[PDB]
Design a protein around this nucleic acid. Structure first.
Lengths: 117, 62, 136
RNA sequence: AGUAUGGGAGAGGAUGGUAGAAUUCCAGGUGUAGCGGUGAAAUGCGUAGAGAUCUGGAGGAAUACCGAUGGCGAAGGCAGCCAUCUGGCCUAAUACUGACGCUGAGGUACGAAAGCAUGGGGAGCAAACAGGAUUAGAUACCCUGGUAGUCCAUGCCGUAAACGAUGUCUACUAGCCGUUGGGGCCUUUGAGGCUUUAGUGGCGCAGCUAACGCGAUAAGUAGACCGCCUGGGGAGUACGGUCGCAAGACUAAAACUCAAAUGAAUUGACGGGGGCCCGCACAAGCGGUGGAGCAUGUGGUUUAAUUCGAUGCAACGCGAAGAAC
């Protein structure tokens, strides 16, 4: 129902999944999709193809709200960041600026132990 | 903060952003944050890196 | 191989039409060295298509081949030209085998004419390749 | 060897403030079916609404980039910024004392991590433990949780591959290339080039060594003092003693047993080490076997006998190129 012209895309790309969330500014969610929601169960959730599929679904869902230009933020060292950002242009939005917002501690908490695989 | 100008394509934007992130080296810190490295291992790795650096400098000098 | 590059084996033109494409189609049709049977099958179909539309047998065959030719395999990459034709002939013989008629020559002519209008299992498989290429 | 006066570098120590990033939790908006995790899964979280995203709050611990074969400290060790108290070191020239030195049995001080005592604190991580996997079994490695502890105050413990596996002090003995803190000279305008000193590194002559290697930061040439060794096990063990709240630490044997146990290097062989290379090895194709009936050989079973041999690839239409007598 609500109409907004400028939006923000969030690509949370981990090593096990990728979540593409489309919101307006001031961070109110409008549409989202994940690789788990399109089959791709188990380990296949991390493939770039699944990220592209999720990004297409999210862009088409947001087209109903009617966005034409958006700003993209990618966080996480996932294998699907490039596919997720590419699929939005294929859908038809205008990417005003796309950036990386991964968090880095300034020597804070202690990470878990190393795997002896 | 890769801000695109008027008319670059999406692929050009992606590749330029990838180059910017490669220059920034955030992914190295993210990988380092996955598991805890003990001070012994850290000192050993840095000593090996220093030795390799000094070996490289002499080769580039000659 | 591993070290060498083996040259492709050049096939002689068909002694009746001087058509390497027709010769390759005959080689694809032929089983266990029975060249005469394959020649009869192919020539019968070429004459049948000529009667049922008065068109040149060679040109009509090349046009249908280009219609049933794919463009991509499958990881997407561009299929080299020889494999395109080799894959199109396989589809055209396989699908023609499954029709119901008195002789193989009549089945081949019938499905050549059918594919000339884009109606046939070979073209359907081509659209399947198109779909699964859109998948990647 | 030491003292006074000028200057300099530093994560040296103790106390108290303070800043930003991030994790967890809590409250509230937007929003809706997944999230999480693995080699693949599952346990687990979620429709009384997660995960994602935005705002605010609470608390604990550690200080990205700079960062360095860098620096400081007797060693153990010491990293955000600021203030207070405080130790040592380097550097210039005069002045001053006049051998005041070196080492050091007993003794004494400090001494990582884990551990102990009393009182606090507890975000993350995580012995013990619980569950899910894997496996012939799993008690482990992997996954989901998780208590001591890790943090603070006041004490104890006195051990580490506490290592440069190299006790402290002094003098002498080719060179070449780096780097840190100072002094001096030279250009000539500001950045470079020569020296000298105290540290910290890489090569290398002589010399030394079983060899590997060391080589002005000696494992070279000499001097002073101390500690320690005398085949491998039994054994850093028992007894006695001292210390400790405890865990334990320190000092420290013998009976008995073997003819070896060790160090360095050489040639092979092997590696679920690394490079390079080849082959119908794979990839791309065309036909088969594994399914049916029959022929033939083998195993087994049966029989009076079912003659004997061949047994992964490299035995099984093999000896047998031919059993009705």
């Amino acid at each position: 129902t609500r109409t907004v012209s400028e939006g923000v895309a969030h690509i949370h790309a981990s090593f096990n999944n990728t979540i593409v969330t489309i919101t307006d500014r001031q961070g109110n969610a409008l549409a989202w999709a994940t690789s788990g929601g399109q089959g791709f169960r188990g380990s296949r959730k991390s493939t770039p193809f699944a990220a592209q599929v999720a990004a297409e679904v999210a862009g088409k869902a947001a087209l109903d709200y009617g966005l034409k230009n958006l700003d993209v933020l990618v966080k996480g060292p996932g294998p699907g960041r490039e596919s997720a950002v590419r699929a939005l242009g294929a859908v038809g939005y205008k990417i005003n600026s796309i950036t990386d917002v991964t968090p880095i501690p300034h020597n804070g908490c202690r990470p878990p132990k190393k795997r002896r695989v | 903060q890769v801000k695109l100008k008027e008319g670059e394509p999406v692929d050009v934007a992606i590749r330029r952003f990838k180059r910017s992130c490669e220059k920034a080296g955030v992914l190295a810190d993210v990988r380092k944050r996955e598991f805890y490295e003990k001070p012994t291992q850290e000192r050993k790795r840095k000593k090996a890196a220093a030795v390799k650096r000094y070996q490289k400098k002499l080769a580039r000098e000659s | 191989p591993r070290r060498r590059v083996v040259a492709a084996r050049e096939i002689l033109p068909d002694p009746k039409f001087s058509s390497q494409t027709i010769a390759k189609f005959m080689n694809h049709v032929m089983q266990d060295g029975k060249k005469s049977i394959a020649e009869s099958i192919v020539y019968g179909a070429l004459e049948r298509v000529q009667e049922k539309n008065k068109v040149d047998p060679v040109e009509f065959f090349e046009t249908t081949l280009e219609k049933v030719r794919p463009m991509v395999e499958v990881v997407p990459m561009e299929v080299r030209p020889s494999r395109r034709t080799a894959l199109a002939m396989r589809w055209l013989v396989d699908a023609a085998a499954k029709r119901s008629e008195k002789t193989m020559a009549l089945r081949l002519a019938g499905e050549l004419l059918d594919a000339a209008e884009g109606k046939g299992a070979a073209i359907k498989k081509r659209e399947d390749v198109h779909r699964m290429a859109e998948a990647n």
